[PDB]
Design a binder for this molecule. Structure first.
Ligand SMILES: CN(C)CCNC(=O)C[C@H](Cc1ccc(F)cc1)NC(=O)[C@@H](Cc1ccc(Cl)cc1Cl)NC(=O)[C@H](N)Cc1ccccc1C#N
Ligand SMILES: CN(C)CCNC(=O)C[C@H](Cc1ccc(F)cc1)NC(=O)[C@@H](Cc1ccc(Cl)cc1Cl)NC(=O)[C@H](N)Cc1ccccc1C#N
Ligand code: NA
Lengths: 302, 302
């Protein structure tokens, strides 16, 4: 028992992290087969970053402008090309530790693990949720660009995020591994802002179920509510509306605990209206929304 | 920027996890050089677990009673021996992925990463603190015994914890890699209890400093306090007393922010007496005490 924010084991991804240097800029790349993926702004200088035209900047580059280091061993670039906001560097060696992998794009509300890296060297691992405004609340210092986010499914790594930038408010923005940004952001050094955020309602319920499975029951009640009467309370507290599809995903957790989804909605209605009265749920005094139904199942009986 | 609970990259440890089977019991072992380490209760049956004598039980065993599996590849046991509460199995192969490592015992209040494993296969990574009562609040299901906790220092893995058991209250107890329990627990299936817990004061202050470094300042004040006048407030709220040695460890964080330790103590005095008034610090509505000064430095400028 116990419920903690858990990351995927990072070893399969650690063997893919390299350091890409161009000019005086150095960041991280992802080495799969004979291709290194990294943020395209690595080709920018300090002055180009204000209003770059990346088509221009790449055309003015050649293979010898990019220094690739897999540990102490320098790799040889034999080709380059741009794929939206990521640069692809072809090298003369297939990474012999290349795992089975996929490039997948995730949905707001879904989670992944981040392997934070500096100069091609992994320094830490943690879990993130894609917020409804397509930012993540991560932990990234200068030089962490190119760090990747990923899920793991039976020794297949699904890469879903590459880190590009920090916004003025301290939240983080990146692309999928095809170079397409999450959200309405561009890789240009101008102050952009995220849209307004909301709480992921289905994740909160999943977390309440996790709490019940772990012996926290103080917030339950005998009452029930209708799907429509709950969505009214959601809008008043800036929660996402609950769908009939969300209830079916919560089936396995409802099944295991005996608590119907709409009975747990009634408990959540009361926590929103009353607060917690000094008590905690799984060690938090706030309602947590960064656990998916899948994260709950995977940790509570998986 | 951003501050998250971060684990060490787990790859160096993933290549050391094996599955040890004896009788109908199967759990995880740690394979370093030609030795596999695992919890000794793997030699117990269901009836021996009530009041075992482990000297007796091991003497009645032989090398062919232990099945070791490093993936699909079965390893051959050529010797066995007991080291307090851990069993050591000698095998005919030195693990070729053995990292540079040390066996270290940690202190209450220090943190480490846990690689949770099931049947020799890593399933997740998270951070833990050793509580002052020598338990940890982890996430462990049946079969996770033998999972290890570890820190990393310049590609040297310091192993500090092996998981053995869950207590009635849901907290977890284990040994160091020399087989000596943390705290007053034994590896016998009887209901034991931990001593009473306390908040790690030096970790809370470290976390307040992390919050300042990340732009959270709402809890600061102009007031200051004396070391002795603060220790009085600590005892009233079940916090550990603050030493002169603790203040010097907080030097680097005090230096970086301009806020003296005893000025931050005055801020903590007020949060304890008043609470948070509905506000949060680094995404929490509670005072967090599972970050060391080292974890803060390592993430906020390291
Ligand atoms: C102090 N604290 C409370 C919060 C303060 N918050 C900030 O200081 C972040 C800061 C906010 C900002 C200010 C003005 C702008 F006009 C745009 C953004 N943002 C930047 O410095 C960006 C600039 C950038 C550069 C390149 C592109 Cl394509 C796109 C961009 Cl917007 N730099 C990165 O993001 C680097 N790549 C990696 C990096 C560098 C420094 C710090 C963090 C990170 C990360 N991760
Ligand atoms: C439901 N929820 C709200 C909280 C309920 N809490 C409990 O159910 C844990 C439960 C609490 C307990 C009850 C009676 C006792 F008398 C001693 C302990 N404890 C055990 O089942 C222990 C027993 C054990 C076995 C061997 C030794 Cl050496 C030492 C020990 Cl005390 N089993 C393990 O710890 C296994 N090794 C691994 C394991 C099995 C099942 C569940 C978790 C874990 C873990 N991790
Ligand atoms: Na984590």
């Amino acid at each position: 028992s116990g419920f903690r924010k858990m990351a995927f084991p990072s070893g399969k991804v650690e063997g893919c992290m390299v350091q890409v240097t161009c000019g005086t800029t150095t960041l991280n790349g992802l080495w799969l087969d004979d291709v290194v993926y990294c943020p395209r702004h690595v080709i920018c200088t300090s002055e180009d970053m204000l209003n770059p035209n990346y088509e221009d900047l790449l055309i003015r580059k050649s293979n010898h402008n990019f220094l690739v280091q897999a540990g102490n061993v320098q790799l040889r670039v034999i080709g380059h090309s741009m794929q939206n906001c990521v640069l692809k560097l072809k090298v003369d060696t297939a990474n012999p530790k290349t795992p089975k992998y996929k490039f997948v794009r995730i949905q707001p509300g879904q989670t992944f693990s981040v392997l934070a890296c500096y100069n091609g060297s992994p320094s830490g691992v943690y879990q993130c949720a894609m917020r409804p405004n397509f930012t993540i609340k991560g932990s990234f210092l200068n030089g962490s660009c190119g760090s990747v986010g990923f899920n793991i499914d039976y020794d297949c790594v699904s890469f879903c995020y590459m880190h590009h930038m920090e916004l003025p408010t301290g939240v983080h923005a990146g692309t999928d591994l095809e170079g397409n940004f999450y959200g309405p952001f561009v890789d240009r050094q101008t102050a952009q802002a995220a849209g307004t955020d909301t709480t992921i309602t289905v994740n909160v319920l999943a977390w309440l179920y996790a709490a019940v499975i772990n012996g926290d029951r103080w917030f339950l009640n005998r009452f029930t509510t209708t799907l429509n009467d709950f969505n009214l309370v959601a809008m008043k507290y800036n929660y996402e509306p609950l769908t009939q599809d969300h209830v079916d995903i919560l089936g396995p957790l409802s099944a295991q605990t005996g608590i119907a989804v709409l009975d747990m909605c009634a408990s959540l209605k009361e926590l929103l209206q009353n607060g917690m009265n000094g008590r905690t749920i799984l060690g938090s005094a706030l309602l947590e929304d960064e656990f998916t139904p899948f994260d709950v199942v995977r940790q509570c009986s998986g």
